[PDB]
Amino acid sequence: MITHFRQAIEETLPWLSSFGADPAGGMTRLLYSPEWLETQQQFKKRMAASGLETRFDEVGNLYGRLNGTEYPQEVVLSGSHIDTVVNGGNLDGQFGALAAWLAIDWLKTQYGAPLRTVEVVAMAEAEGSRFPYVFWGSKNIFGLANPDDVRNICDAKGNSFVDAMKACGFTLPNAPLTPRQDIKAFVELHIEQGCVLESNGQSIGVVNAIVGQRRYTVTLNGESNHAGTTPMGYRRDTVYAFSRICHQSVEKAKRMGDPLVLTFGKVEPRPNTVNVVPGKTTFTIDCRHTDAAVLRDFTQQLENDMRAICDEMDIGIDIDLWMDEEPVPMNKELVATLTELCEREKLNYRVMHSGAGHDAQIFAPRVPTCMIFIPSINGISHNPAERTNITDLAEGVKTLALMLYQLAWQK
Amino acid sequence: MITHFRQAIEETLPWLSSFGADPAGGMTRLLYSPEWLETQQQFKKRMAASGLETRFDEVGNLYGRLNGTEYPQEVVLSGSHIDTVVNGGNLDGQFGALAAWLAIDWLKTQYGAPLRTVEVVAMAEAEGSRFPYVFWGSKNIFGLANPDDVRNICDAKGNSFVDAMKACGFTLPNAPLTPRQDIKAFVELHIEQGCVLESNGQSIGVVNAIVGQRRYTVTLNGESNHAGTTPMGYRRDTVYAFSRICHQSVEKAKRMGDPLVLTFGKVEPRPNTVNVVPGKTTFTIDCRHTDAAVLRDFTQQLENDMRAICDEMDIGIDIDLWMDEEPVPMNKELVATLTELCEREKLNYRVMHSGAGHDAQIFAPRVPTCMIFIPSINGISHNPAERTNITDLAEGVKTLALMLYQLAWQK
Ligand SMILES: NC(=O)NC(NC(N)=O)C(=O)[O-]
Ligand SMILES: NC(=O)NC(NC(N)=O)C(=O)[O-]
Ligand SMILES: [Mn+2]
Ligand SMILES: [Mn+2]
């Protein structure tokens, strides 16, 4: 069975990874890009060929469905996001969608139709890496996505959300969607992304909680001027202002210690020229913690700090909080069932939280959910070198299969 | 004379400014761009039509020639650069080329052919705004440019110098050019760019020196990784490193005080995504001073500081000094002539240095050269709001005309 999944992964992973392969390294498959569309089209086609009933929903989440014999109205769901960051790896997101499909297909062949319906899902986006919105895919599954929040947003190159979506053959809905009521449980297999499993020698992570997370886009407005003729004390330099903000804030975060993390990942000065004092800089903030209050208090302090610096420098600031998620626990009963499985199968597991966000955190408050981690070598992710031992991946798909067996082929 | 020049400027300025007009603001006419080409062609056309014999040299420097009746082998040269920064104003560079033409045209119709030959020049580039090379135009006039230095460089978008240059109709020389020997004097009219003239209430700047200037491209290499799962202590974050460098260095520059200027105008993190610790940042440094030793000492200290910071952070650093120009004085005899001219005309002038770089600084060590400044309102330059009162502009052209009258219509 490990042998089967190994083979299946070796067969399909390289194939799936070709759609959105970036010449500059790794994967770049952003929400509603042509690469995004082609991935979902091809993936759909392969699931169909395997005998699954396939569909898009109104926003382009992809489903492969195998109907239940005794409770067709109850759905056990598994999968993950297909989107990536820029120059990402080929496991983050897509592996969990691929795995759910491989698990289901194998269960189908070994044990025939399930008692209750099982679905593979490949969700539209969870990376929040193209537009200033996150979890467009999963939020729509539960009608949590307000179309007003994306009707007026663009990517870095000025393409509107609405246009890109339409280019992929989807129409922005007029109002939030009807939330699904038929889901009994959701199970997301995913690479750990950090090195907790690898450094402690363990093979499977049983996730019991996911971190809280804020993302900001901040815009500094100063004055563009000549690099040579503008005396230093007359300047309104947005890159200098940005640097004080970044330097001071990272310093503060380092004093708070783990698990506070703080990242200034994207910086865009304008006009971005060697001999021009930059009169505008737009940058992002990503900040996370296991505790909601710590995350709130720390980030609010950061907002005050930024306003203080800017005010002192006579520079305009616009602070745009576009992701604000509470930490969420996984379902206790499902976490026990998973732990019990690991004990029974004699798996070398650990119980741990996720430092990454996942569609699972959107699911959790609405339907019973849990996550299975497998290791990430060197704790490298969002980097083309992201990789995992093939037997570890297979062990993950096996563990996923057994969980889905319990949940859908048993009453 | 003033009214003629006011009208001449009001006619030709919006015309010349239409080539390279950037919809997003101001002017964007970079070396060897389509806008660059059109500008040079259109200017060449109008000059020829006004009765000047025009040529391009091997690199796209544009000349408008009026031959001299008694010493045709002696050339009095005037003009400036036609390129711009990104979203620049419409006076920097082009106004002095425009003025030279307007002045020679007017002198020609009032006093006929000059004794010596006079030429307008519109030089290819002095902004160093597109490729990592500066003064490609004026350096080639004197055979100072090594073709090897540009053969393998590219713009930010990956366009090679050689391809851009070929696309414009010019062939990269196999070796350094033969310097012109026939130039007797160079006069460059130009806006001040700073606010010295405006704030002291004067109308004409008699430039006696130009600053030294260094430009670096610095490349930091760390490791891209996941914003959430990578603990702070395990990071090699290049934006954080950059920000430490920029913050500290600007602080030191302020401690040195005027005339030291230091600018970090361009920053390019990779992959530049909100939830990715950026594993690479490329940024520029622009640093200038009136004194060669101060500039050298400060920037070398900056080089040590950056190395120290990066060694401490385990981040690789590459430092590429691509412009290293000494400060240079204008010709004593010409400055005196220009000063004496201002005295006789009772122009409210002052003697000052230029904090900006100019083709005149490349000319100076080879031919007698001087510059004339006119005010810049609010000391705004390298910014679409770059403006100078029309009478000041007229007054500068007038001054240039008189200066050229003495140099060329007199023995
Ligand atoms: N599994 C992920 O990489 N998720 C990413 N996306 C969200 N929404 O968290 C991230 O940055 O952690
Ligand atoms: N007149 C200019 O703006 N020149 C520019 N160009 C050079 N080479 O200095 C600059 O940055 O100052
Ligand atoms: Mn990710
Ligand atoms: Mn300039």
Swiss-Prot record, chains A, B:
UniProtKB keywords: Cytoplasm, Hydrolase, Metal-binding, Purine metabolism, Zinc
Molecular function GO labels: allantoate deiminase activity; manganese ion binding; protein homodimerization activity; zinc ion binding
Activity-pH dependence: Optimum pH is 8. Less active under acidic conditions.
Binding, Zn(2+) 1: H81, D92, H190
Major place of residence: cytoplasm
Protein's UniProt keywords contain Metal-binding: yes
Gene3D superfamilies in UniProt: 3.30.70.360, Zn peptidases
Binding site for allantoate: R215, N275, R288
One GO CC annotation: cytoplasm
Recorded metabolic or biological pathway in which this protein acts: Nitrogen metabolism; (S)-allantoin degradation
Note on how the cofactor is bound: Binds 2 Zn(2+) ions per subunit. Also able to bind Mn(2+).
Reactions that this protein is recorded to catalyse: allantoate + H2O + 2 H(+) = (S)-2-ureidoglycine + NH4(+) + CO2
Induction: By glyoxylate and allantoin under anaerobic conditions.
Binding site for Zn(2+) 2: D92, E127, H382
Top-level lineage group: Bacteria
Coiled-coil regions listed: none
Activity regulation note: Sulfate could be an allosteric effector of the enzyme that is responsible for stabilizing substrate binding. In addition, this anion effector may act as a counterion during enzyme-mediated catalysis.
Kinase recorded as keyword: no
Cofactor(s) the protein needs: Zn(2+)
Protein localization: Cytoplasm
Pfam family of the protein (one): Peptidase_M20
Enzyme Commission number(s) from the entry: 3.5.3.9
Subunit structure of this chain's protein: Homodimer.
Primary role: Involved in the anaerobic nitrogen utilization via the assimilation of allantoin. Catalyzes specifically the hydrolysis of allantoate to yield CO2, NH3 and S-ureidoglycine, which is unstable and readily undergoes a second deamination by S-ureidoglycine aminohydrolase AllE to yield S-ureidoglycolate and NH3. In vivo, the spontaneous release of S-ureidoglycolate and ammonia from S-ureidoglycine appears to be too slow to sustain an efficient flux of nitrogen.
Family: Belongs to the peptidase M20 family.
Protein name as catalogued: Allantoate amidohydrolase
Organism: Escherichia coli (strain K12)
Organism ancestry: Bacteria, Pseudomonadati, Pseudomonadota, Gammaproteobacteria, Enterobacterales
Gene: allC
